């Protein structure tokens, strides 16, 4: 009987962990702030005291953490993953991080006798809740296979992209496009309002043509309402652009558009919108 | 009842052809007369100048490259203003700035003509298919009179108010499109540098919230490295230029648009002006 | 006996016209808002009702106007320059405009039997007051020569750069560099203060090294004081960057840096700093 | 009394040599041992590893490429930490981020050594001439002890407080420098395209409020098309990278620096990494 661990019960991790419990897996959870475990425990998960405790006890442990710093602290820190993982047990880090971080975590886990897979996802809060994430995995093939039933509870589509690092790279490339699309939509709507245009009509014109997409439809309504309930935290969008630009630096790939969008998201953080939805970059694009 | 058509380019050719096939009485003109031949063969008449067309046709449509071209056809010798009058209509469907369309409308109106701007969203194929989105602004009665023709050209028609509003909507829409293209281009460039399969990148994009026909279509050009022209790169650069100028007038900062504009200028300088606008990829990837 | 006209008594024009009056020239002034003529008349200038009136009666008329729209309006508008210029009388437009504007004005002036010279300047309010401008002239060589004594009252350095358009291009190139230097200084000081560094020390380090220049010294003090009394209006710097980017468009010259600076200056305008010194772009660079 | 010097590059070589000529007892090391030969000929001693240098010298200076290099020399096998102790000092003059210098400082101090960061403003010639501006931060007793050496290396030395403050000041200063270089380069590129004389442009600049030694010196490279290396283009790009990352940590947006950073990356991609940083011009002009 395969048992599951889950570290990081945030906006994404909460719903993802809940999906595993509801699918009927034996799930052990941990979160830095213990209060976030409560709803998962009430659903039937067991609470653990540290990442080390989870990885010592569970056949497959999944992590869904904020950023490279969080991922590294949970792996390498006191009572962290490396103090418990071993004996073939698996660690699947689904956090969005850079390829150097995922590679380092994987090498460490492997050296302790664990198996490692990175599996960042495309899809926001609602997809996490619904189990319709796109999973971008890379690393240990036997672990990818073993986690199949769990991935089916979490996502609608699962790819294995090769060696550790390719998953992170795919995720960063996809989100770099997304960040620039959001600033494009935001600048368009800001200019539109200054033009006296009806924002609803602008969205209707976009939805009838070749650019029509669900993100424009959904985020567009936030722009009209001026309300930005958080699906994907603006601070994490800015983190992903930061990471894309750093990746471009390492590969010798110039990214004028991404760099510009990165700085606009930094402006939005500076102006106090870090914890709002990433669509809230609009608040520093419109006057 | 009678229609005229000025500018038989990538967009104007198919548009005029739709009006002829739909049975409208169409008189065409183009700066380069050779472009008229195919439409004459379909059943259009041919005229020697815009003034000649606007003097004889109840409603004249223009589909020209840029504000300079629009202004030259309107204000130039043997131009629109020398023929328009008597309530006859001029519908400029060229993508231009609001100052240009406003100026053209004022002059047309002063001459006793009716003016409507009606730039479109949709590229070569939609123009061929008659599935354009028409963004009209200006004279209400002319918009009404143009209904049957618009139905042959487009799948959707809006009247956005006073002259200028159509030009603003179009520039806003194309500004988003220009930034989406550089975004896809930068992503594919980084992805290929990362050793990722470009096809898989497109597949992930098509499975998620950003999925759209443009990424699907232009994505395949990025993979093949062939950029057959639907929307010329130079015209996209022109549109970004106009959007930045509009932002300037309205006091709207546009860091993203401005950066995309300069990347499209790099692509023009690198010799890709006449390729599809997706060829901006050629200056984004190493 | 050469008589002089002067159109546009703004931040630059007022002190420039005043230098001509103090040097002993017979000067006739006009300004759209006639109230700005009072101080010049008090110094000994005469006042006219229109540009046409000035250009019909004066041997050489100088204009120092805001922008291409102003220059074209004063030239081509009702009771404008073309209604009065003729008989070999000279028109010297010292406004900062694009090359297509100065070329068009020059052609129209010449068609009326006038002589035209464009002569934009490098140097701000204090140099205008002190008569230490750098004059970047292009156009009619006889008019350049005839204006020698007036130019000596206005500037410390005078160049003839060839055909009309060449002076405008030199001025726009020079100011494009200046605009980018101002955002560079502004961003540096903003980052520095965020780092807990002493701004005075930052300025001291810059002044001791290879970048040391009078602009950094002078504008640096504004940044420290938080007051931006106007030497060069922010709106006019933004206008100059706009024209440089449009010039680059025409010449097929990409300008990522200028384009970015242009947009930052637009932000500063939108935030209400249009009529402060251009160093006030700092107000939107700093948090 | 006794000194060590690690890293004999474009800057390190001339700096070590100034210390030898001033009569200091200097022991040098460089990853590539051949670089030591000229210093040894001047009267320096040579060591086999950073550990060896730091175990034997009262004060050791490092002048290394980047944070990667600085960390490897500190934390790696036979590195600084395996030798430093007993109150002996380590002065890292490399241009790195404040996180790197803080981490190095913390490790050195835990080993019983003293740490000072002291990055410098000034390029190859100032290094040769001993006219660097030294931007130190960290242990005060070490700053005082290093006074005589700093006097032979520089014309001005500041103590800016806790470790990290020197790195921040250096990155701020070089961020400005990087943007000035792209500004000058874009201006000269546009000017040449305008048919203006590049020499006259430089002359107009030198007569006005922007006049500075950097424009005068780099301007001549732009005219000649030769970029002999004073400050490697790859290190300028590294410095802008670090400024952008520092801005990220402090929540300070930097549109100008970010744009300049990407232009320098283009110049690296175009093959100019080892030329003078003024060679960014080669990707700004057409
Ligand atoms: N939201 C989305 O639409 C979306 C979509 C795809 C991918 N992602 C990615 O998924 C990951 C999680 O995002 P999210 O939206 O769930 O973010 P979130 O709500 O901010 O959650 C972050 C999680 O990481 C934990 N954490 C942060 N720092 C930590 C540290 N130093 N040590 C231990 N735990 C730490 C938090 O614990 P505490 O509760 O103690 O703070 C929380 O559990 C991120 O990489 C994000 O980019 C998000
Ligand atoms: N292609 C698209 O996907 C697309 C989509 C929506 C809107 N648009 C807009 O539609 C307009 C037409 O675009 P297009 O793709 O059809 O352009 P195109 O193929 O380049 O042709 C432009 C037309 O303008 C004419 N023209 C150019 N300069 C002229 C001048 N000085 N005087 C008279 N006529 C002149 C050309 O005549 P000649 O044959 O003599 O050169 C040609 O007929 C543009 O404003 C464009 O931005 C394009
Ligand atoms: N300030 C500097 O450091 C500096 C340095 C070098 C070059 N320049 C350039 O010199 C020119 C003047 O600068 P400035 O600082 O003197 O500008 P300013 O104080 O804003 O004055 C602009 C002048 O133009 C006039 N004007 C504006 N629009 C007009 C119109 N539509 N019709 C007639 N007159 C109009 C104004 O008249 P009203 O009084 O009626 O408003 C005013 O006299 C600008 O091109 C600027 O870029 C400035
Ligand atoms: N050049 C300037 O105008 C200037 C001005 C002020 C500050 N700086 C800064 O000063 C520092 C040195 O610059 P530079 O111009 O002297 O650079 P450089 O000529 O490229 O030399 C870099 C030095 O670092 C060493 N190095 C690189 N990677 C190493 C590693 N992994 N392990 C051990 N040593 C390593 C090199 O050793 P090898 O010989 O074995 O390769 C060389 O001695 C840089 O941080 C630079 O940004 C430069």
């Amino acid at each position: 009987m395969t048992t599951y661990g889950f570290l990081g019960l945030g906006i994404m991790g909460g719903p993802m962990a809940a999906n595993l419990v509801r699918a009927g897996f034996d799930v052990t959870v941990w979160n830095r702030n213990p209060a976030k475990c409560a709803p998962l425990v009430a659903l039937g998960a067991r609470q653990a005291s540290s990442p080390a405790e989870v990885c010592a006890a569970c056949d497959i442990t999944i992590a869904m953490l904020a950023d490279p710093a969080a991922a590294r602290e949970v792996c390498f820190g006191a009572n962290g993953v490396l103090e418990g993982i071993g004996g073939g047990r698996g660690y699947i880090d689904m956090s969005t991080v850079d390829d150097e971080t995922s590679t380092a975590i994987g090498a460490a886990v492997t050296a302790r006798g664990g198996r490692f897979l990175e599996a960042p996802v495309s899809g926001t809060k609602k997809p996490a809740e619904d189990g319709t994430l796109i999973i971008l995995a890379a690393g240990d093939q036997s672990l990818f296979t073993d986690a199949g039933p769990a991935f089916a509870a979490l996502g609608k589509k699962c790819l294995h992209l090769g060696e550790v690092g390719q998953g992170a790279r795919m995720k960063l490339v996809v989100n770099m496009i997304m960040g620039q699309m959001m600033t494009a939509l935001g600048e368009g709507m800001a200019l539109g309002r200054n033009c006296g245009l009806d924002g609803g009509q602008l969205l209707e014109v976009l939805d009838a043509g070749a650019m029509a997409n669900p993100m424009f439809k959904g985020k567009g309504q936030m722009l009209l309402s001026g309300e930005f309930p958080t699906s994907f935290p603006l601070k994490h969008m800015q983190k992903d652009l930061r990471l894309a630009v750093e990746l471009g630096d390492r590969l010798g790939q110039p990214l004028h558009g991404a760099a510009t969008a990165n700085e606009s998201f930094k402006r939005a953080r500076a102006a106090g919108h870090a914890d709002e939805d990433f669509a809230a970059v609009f608040r520093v694009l419109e006057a």
Side-chain angles (χ1 to χ4, degrees), chain A residues 128-197:
Chain A
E129 288 163 355
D130 293 349
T132 59
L133 297 172
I134 301 164
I135 296 169
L136 307 169
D140 186 293
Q141 272 271 13
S142 73
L143 179 52
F144 180 80
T145 294
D146 285 348
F151 281 164
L154 297 178
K156 65 181 185 182
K157 179 183 180 67
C158 297
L159 299 173
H160 186 281
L161 297 167
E163 310 272 20
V164 176
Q166 295 300 280
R169 288 171 170 196
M170 181 68 79
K171 172 61 184 171
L172 290 179
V173 166
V174 171
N175 269 26
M176 176 177 73
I177 298 175
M178 190 178 74
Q180 295 188 243
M181 283 179 68
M182 184 69 239
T183 58
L185 178 69
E187 280 185 6
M189 178 73 71
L191 178 60
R193 298 271 200 66
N194 242 314
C195 282
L197 299 181

Side-chain angles (χ1 to χ4, degrees), chain A residues 13-55:
Chain A
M16 290 164 72
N19 280 343
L20 297 181
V21 175
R22 293 194 209 97
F25 301 109
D26 179 334
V27 183
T28 300
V29 302
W30 172 89
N31 193 65
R32 175 178 60 171
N33 169 17
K36 298 305 183 70
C37 296
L40 287 126
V41 177
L43 269 180
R46 278 187 24 88
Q47 185 178 359
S49 296
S50 68
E53 182 194 331
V54 175
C55 292

Side-chain angles (χ1 to χ4, degrees), chain A residues 3 28 86 93 96 155 177 191 252 260 282:
Chain A
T3 61
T28 300
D93 197 349
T96 297
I177 298 175
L191 178 60
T260 294
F282 179 67

Side-chain angles (χ1 to χ4, degrees), chain A residues 40-280:
Chain A
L40 287 126
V41 177
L43 269 180
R46 278 187 24 88
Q47 185 178 359
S49 296
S50 68
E53 182 194 331
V54 175
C55 292
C58 297
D59 296 303
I60 300 181
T61 296
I62 292 174
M64 193 54 165
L65 302 165
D67 60 10
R72 286 173 178 271
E73 179 170 1
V74 164
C75 177
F76 296 101
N79 310 305
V81 170
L82 298 179
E83 297 192 358
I85 201 81
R89 296 185 291 284
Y91 187 58
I92 302 178
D93 197 349
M94 301 186 83
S95 310
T96 297
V97 297
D98 60 286
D99 53 331
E100 299 199 312
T101 293
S102 65
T103 293
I105 289 167
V109 164
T110 302
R112 293 273 196 166
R115 297 176 293 158
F116 179 76
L117 186 75
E118 67 176 357
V121 304
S122 180
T124 185
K125 185 170 97 79
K126 175 166 165 59
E129 288 163 355
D130 293 349
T132 59
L133 297 172
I134 301 164
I135 296 169
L136 307 169
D140 186 293
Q141 272 271 13
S142 73
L143 179 52
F144 180 80
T145 294
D146 285 348
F151 281 164
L154 297 178
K156 65 181 185 182
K157 179 183 180 67
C158 297
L159 299 173
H160 186 281
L161 297 167
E163 310 272 20
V164 176
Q166 295 300 280
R169 288 171 170 196
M170 181 68 79
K171 172 61 184 171
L172 290 179
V173 166
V174 171
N175 269 26
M176 176 177 73
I177 298 175
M178 190 178 74
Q180 295 188 243
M181 283 179 68
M182 184 69 239
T183 58
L185 178 69
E187 280 185 6
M189 178 73 71
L191 178 60
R193 298 271 200 66
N194 242 314
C195 282
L197 299 181
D198 184 319
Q201 252 181 349
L202 169 56
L203 290 175
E204 162 186 346
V205 170
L206 291 170
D207 202 52
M211 291 175 278
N213 64 87
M215 175 186 146
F216 279 8
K217 168 166 293 180
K219 303 308 185 181
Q221 289 304 310
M222 288 185 187
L223 305 194
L224 299 186
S225 71
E227 294 270 57
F228 305 88
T230 308
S231 287
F232 177 43
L234 189 142
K235 63 189 178 189
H236 296 151
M237 177 77 272
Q238 192 271 305
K239 179 261 303 177
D240 291 351
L241 285 166
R242 159 207 313 162
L243 296 184
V245 169
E246 293 171 6
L247 177 58
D249 189 322
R250 294 193 295 278
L251 297 175
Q253 173 66 57
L255 300 161
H256 278 282
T260 294
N262 188 28
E263 306 304 308
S264 291
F265 275 100
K266 290 180 195 171
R267 290 184 285 153
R269 284 185 89 146
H273 310 293
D275 290 314
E276 294 171 62
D277 192 73
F278 79 115

